[PDB]
Design a protein around this ligand. Structure first.
Ligand SMILES: Cc1ncsc1-c1ccc(CNC(=O)[C@@H]2C[C@@H](O)CN2C(=O)[C@@H](NC(=O)CCCCCN2CCCN(c3nccc(-c4noc([C@@]5(C)CCCc6sc(N)c(C#N)c65)n4)n3)[C@@H](C)C2)C(C)(C)C)cc1
Ligand SMILES: Nc1nc2c(ncn2[C@@H]2O[C@H](COP(=O)(O)OP(=O)(O)O)[C@@H](O)[C@H]2O)c(=O)[nH]1
Ligand SMILES: [Mg+2]
Lengths: 104, 155, 86, 144
């Protein structure tokens, strides 16, 4: 069963799909295909809890009803600046306008 | 004023069963071809009452006029008998057409088995339960529409 | 395989190419990376979610779920969907 | 009228099942092809309904007449009932286009009077005003 995710770092957000049985390690390989940075250089987080490679998406929390196509689950990503890994920093999206009078 | 609408196959006894309530006197041969409204002035469980029982009759006609007529039926008695079984096979069609005209699945209603020797259909008491409706095992020869009048009140 | 749609406000969204071809305006503009200048991140993120929904549920046999759109973003997504022919 | 039920009088038992989050209005296309409305079904509800061989049915959102799919197609005509077993009609949401879904939600929040009070390009005002009605689809459908 697929989980639909948004892997996010700074102002880079990736829309990909993965199997609930996929390992977190395997997820880092998919990012390596796109951002060309190795798994040893990636740290994946769910909210701010860090994920372990051998755990599977399911076990981390990503599940069919939490990771739906139309409402995917956010997976945080932090890259490795040489010896130490940067802090997870995901920059948010822009806020929307005040709901117009006619609509409320 | 409470409008009731009795309904069935030709031969069930709607035309007769009305006579026992309105006239308390059986008509063994009645013309199965004409429908009239029998207004009544009867106390029911202590209330002001004026029934408007329709004795349905005629050939089926799926028309605008006739649908809106039976849609005014505040409640129906779907009469079937035990001599015949074709009767018990038309009973579903009538029930369902009442839901179409009344725009709802839930309509005050009552299955009724009549003429209780042949016994083609044993007491389907079970069917009525799925219909979610009562049963009076009526015998015009020897008659409760009050059975049905409850449902309508509950409504 | 993958393309980068970039919001007005700098956000970069890497969605599959097949998914972004759900958009007519993107289908032509890719004839790679695109830059939309009147679409804020929160509208394009939402648009990229629709790409995923249409591709997964198009030609399904059983129940599809509703595409949720909040009241706050409704007006902006309509215009963006008009501009992007999807 | 080519799209119309054939008056066959042969009973066919069908099951309407609302696998949609909307209230489904079953619409029956009558002997002269005119859309005739039937009792609504709440979301998640399945009812055993009694139709006839050859009848045509279409399914829409009772409130806004938005279009729904039945067994993944737009029109339902009960197939042969085999040994008295029900024929299943699975009413589902269609994959609306992003634009049409946004029109469905904006019509949702806003009265029709104030569509012109919205800061949108005029084309969108005409789009938001062009609601879906069953009869237009029939003609479209009839051509194909
Ligand atoms: C719950 C729900 N949730 C979501 S949808 C839904 C729902 C709810 C209900 C239904 C019910 N199904 C239908 O509506 C289906 C669906 C569609 O395919 C068309 N259609 C139909 O039935 C349509 N018929 C047909 O094409 C062919 C019908 C052929 C029947 C043949 N006949 C032949 C002769 C024997 N018999 C027979 N002899 C004598 C009297 C009757 C009779 N019968 O009634 C009635 C009464 C008076 C009973 C009180 C209420 C009404 S009102 C009135 N107008 C009535 C009338 N005269 C009646 N007297 N009968 C019948 C037993 C059998 C039509 C639109 C023309 C009526 C469908 C969906
Ligand atoms: N055995 C028996 N016959 C009945 C009973 N009620 C009516 N009948 C007869 O069955 C027929 C029904 O006639 P009628 O009421 O006009 O039928 P309708 O027009 O279909 O209601 C008549 O011949 C009646 O004499 C009953 O309770 N028992
Ligand atoms: Mg009579």
């Amino acid at each position: 069963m697929d989980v639909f995710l948004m892997i996010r770092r700074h102002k880079t957000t990736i829309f990909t799909d993965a199997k609930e049985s996929s390992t977190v390690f395997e997820l880092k390989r998919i990012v390596e295909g796109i951002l060309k940075r190795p798994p040893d250089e990636q740290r994946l987080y769910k909210d701010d809890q860090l994920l372990d490679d051998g755990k599977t998406l399911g076990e981390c929390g990503f599940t069919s009803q939490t990771a739906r196509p139309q409402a995917p689950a956010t997976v945080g990503l932090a890259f490795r600046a040489d010896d130490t890994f940067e802090a997870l920093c995901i920059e948010p999206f822009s806020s929307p306008p005040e709901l117009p009078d006619v609509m409320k | 004023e409470y409008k009731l609408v009795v309904v069935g196959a030709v031969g069930v006894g709607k035309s007769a069963l009305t006579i026992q309530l309105i006239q308390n006197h059986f008509v063994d041969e009645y013309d199965p071809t004409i429908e009239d409204s029998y207004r009544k002035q009867v106390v029911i469980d202590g209330e002001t009452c004026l029934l408007d029982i329709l004795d349905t009759a005629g050939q089926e006609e799926y028309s605008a006029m006739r649908d809106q007529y039976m849609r005014t039926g505040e409640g129906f008695l779907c009469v079937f008998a035990i001599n015949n079984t074709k009767s018990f096979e038309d009973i579903h069609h009538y029930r369902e057409q009442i839901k179409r005209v009344k725009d709802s699945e839930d309509v005050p209603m009552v299955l009724v088995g009549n003429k209780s020797p042949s016994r083609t259909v044993d007491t389907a008491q079970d069917l009525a339960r799925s219909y979610g409706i009562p049963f009076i095992e009526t015998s015009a020869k020897t008659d409760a529409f009050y059975t049905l009048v409850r449902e309508i009140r509950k409504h | 395989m993958y393309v980068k749609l970039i919001s007005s406000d700098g956000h970069e969204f890497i969605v599959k190419r097949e998914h972004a071809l759900t958009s007519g305006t993107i289908k032509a503009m890719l004839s790679n990376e695109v830059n939309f200048r009147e679409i804020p991140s929160h509208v394009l993120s939402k648009v990229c979610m629709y790409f995923t929904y249409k591709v997964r549920y198009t030609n399904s046999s059983t129940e599809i779920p509703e595409f949720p759109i909040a009241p706050e973003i409704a007006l902006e997504l309509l215009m963006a969907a008009n501009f992007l022919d999807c | 009228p080519v799209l119309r039920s054939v008056n066959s009088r042969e009973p066919s038992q069908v099951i309407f099942c609302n696998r949609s989050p909307r209230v489904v209005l079953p619409v029956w296309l009558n002997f002269d092809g005119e859309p005739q409305p039937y009792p609504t079904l709440p979301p998640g509800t399945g009812r055993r309904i009694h139709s006839y061989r050859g009848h045509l049915w279409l399914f829409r959102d009772a409130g806004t007449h938005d279009g729904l799919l039945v067994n993944q197609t737009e029109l339902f005509v009960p197939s042969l009932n085999v040994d008295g077993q029900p024929i299943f009609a699975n009413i589902t949401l269609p994959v609306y286009t992003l634009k049409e879904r946004c029109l469905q939600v904006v019509r949702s929040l806003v009265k029709p009077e104030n569509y012109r009070r919205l800061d949108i390009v005029r084309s969108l005002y005409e789009d938001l005003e062009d609601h879906p009605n069953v009869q237009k689809d029939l003609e479209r459908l009839t051509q194909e």
